[PDB]
Design a binder for this molecule. Structure first.
Ligand SMILES: [Cl-]
Ligand SMILES: [Cl-]
Ligand SMILES: [Cl-]
Ligand SMILES: [Cl-]
Lengths: 334, 334
């Protein structure tokens, strides 16, 4: 008889670049406060958000992903031909099928490359990044695109005084490939499925399709439940990720938690025992909560301002719907 | 520069078991023929389908996935405590969020384990299995559940003369873990995003939500286009998968293509130059096309009839929406 072959690729993998796409339209707190009894002062104090970007009607999660990938490729000095696969992570691709990944690949001029869509709420980026790293190390690919993208705005109920000022749109991609030294730490992930209702679409699409003249679905957020969970549990997740990467808290240069709420993230900083001079992502102020796109958007922001430098040691922690979390230590890209 | 650590897992990974859930309700060709001009004879001759199963109204992709996982765990002699992660592959989770994986995990009594949803049409199982193997070999997990699940019945237009008799419901799960010998070969995958319309939801959920007085969304299949692509291209994909696994066509005991159409799979059998006595999955006769669930359901069927034996060398080829494909050689589970 015979034995199935065992193969592998390059074990040392890193981020070669990040590229970001932020839709043109700025929406201020004042504009949001047209339909709720609140204020700019209240929203900012409670969430850290001042403005956010909304995509145009002719844009989609897929279209924004493609643009982010184009920019990541340019920032890496690479072309579509250099990519072996693409993982699209999103929760706002509004078709059951086909998946966005093949269309994104085709738009980039690499229609034939492997790829799929990964959905895990905000934790989607960490899972997709870990999955790309795993695939590359295993020899299934040499270089990959991982893109987080969300068009959340069409799912927002603008009268919902719990979340209409939270969610927003955008996309950001990383090129993942072989590096001289290890650039992506082990994935630390998990969930709490018992709190699946905390971030949800309230009416499923089929129930809706069978009663379309009735209420339509919107995203709902049980804010305090998520706040409590994230603020209390993500510190341990961070410690596990640093432990797995073999780094001490005081070695982290840059902290990039999912941009859910500034107060949650501030509490995490105070729990994580980072250096006083550690750089902390605050992209939320002008980006809001872009779920799956949040972390790569925040990474791009930090590099843009120069607050983060290429090579900086970064701790990434994604947390959100499903109650799903995913974290890893990485070295900052270009 | 601070160095980043790397974990390592098992070298030899395989399918420990499969578990299958087939919904109670049997739907005959004639019962489908009620809103179209066709016959049982025609459907069977053209597609290889005699009956299919429909899930009840109180069932979902997620609920079926859970039951399939329960059975897979039983068939492996394992409990939920033995599982480190779960990947749900589906294209019919009818909520943008939360993802199904955490709720499946919670239902099984392992609310905390890592997991995510992966969408790639019919190729989803191959991608998820590949990702599970990659994660385990990478040391991110030791044992995983990979479950393909589909509730397509509510997306069927009974007046669609091209596909109303094609799609169906069901779920099947595999336990993936360390094995004495190599059980999962290298992943071979790719797509054709230029043919993204071939299998699609015709109207996106948001456009639909904004126009309730218009048509509702249904799944559409450009049958001939998919037939052509699969019949002409999947042979090469199979040969690539066998080559990567270091096995010859004449060493394959079992061929498990996606159950899209019996005549496509018959053509593939001939093209692949397999042994005269090689066994070809034909679960489609009483299952129809269950997209992501199709391959593991077919595997379970072959094991049920005894056509496949545990340990048998099997070629898997998933082909479907997005135009996505994923293939690998595996050893059959229990
Ligand atoms: Cl604290
Ligand atoms: Cl989220
Ligand atoms: Cl069969
Ligand atoms: Cl499909």
């Amino acid at each position: 008889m015979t034995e199935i072959a065992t193969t592998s690729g390059a074990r040392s993998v890193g981020l070669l670049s990040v590229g970001a796409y932020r839709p043109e339209r700025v929406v201020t707190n004042d504009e949001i406060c047209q339909h709720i009894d609140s204020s700019d002062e209240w929203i900012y104090t409670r969430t850290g958000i001042k403005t956010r970007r909304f995509a145009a009607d002719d844009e989609s999660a897929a279209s924004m992903a493609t643009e982010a990938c184009r920019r990541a490729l340019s920032n890496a000095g690479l072309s579509a031909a250099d990519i072996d696969g693409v993982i699209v992570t999103t929760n706002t691709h509004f078709l059951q099928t086909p998946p966005a990944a093949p269309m994104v690949a085709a738009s980039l001029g690499a229609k034939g490359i492997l790829g799929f869509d990964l959905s895990a709420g905000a934790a989607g980026f960490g899972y997709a990044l870990g999955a790309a790293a795993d695939m590359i190390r295993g020899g299934g690919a040499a270089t990959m695109l991982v893109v987080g993208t969300e068009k959340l705005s069409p799912t927002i109920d603008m009268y919902d005084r719990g979340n209409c000022f939270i969610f927003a749109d955008g996309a950001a991609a990383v090129v993942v490939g072989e590096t001289p030294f290890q650039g992506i730490g082990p994935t630390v992930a998990g969930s709490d499925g018992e709190q699946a209702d905390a971030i949800r679409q309230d009416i499923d699409w089929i129930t809706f399709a069978q009663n379309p003249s009735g209420p339509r679905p919107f995203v709902r957020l049980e804010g305090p439940a998520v706040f409590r969970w994230a603020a209390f549990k993500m510190g341990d997740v961070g410690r596990r990720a640093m432990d797995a990467a073999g780094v001490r808290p005081d070695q982290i240069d840059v902290f990039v938690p999912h941009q859910a709420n500034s107060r949650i993230n501030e509490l995490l900083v105070k729990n994580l025992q980072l250096r006083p001079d550690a750089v902390v992502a605050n992209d939320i102020e002008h980006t809001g909560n872009t779920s799956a796109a949040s972390i790569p958007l925040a990474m791009a922001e930090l590099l843009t301002t120069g607050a983060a430098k290429p090579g900086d040691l970064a701790l990434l922690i994604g947390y959100g719907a499903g109650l799903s979390y995913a974290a890893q230590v990485v070295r900052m890209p270009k």
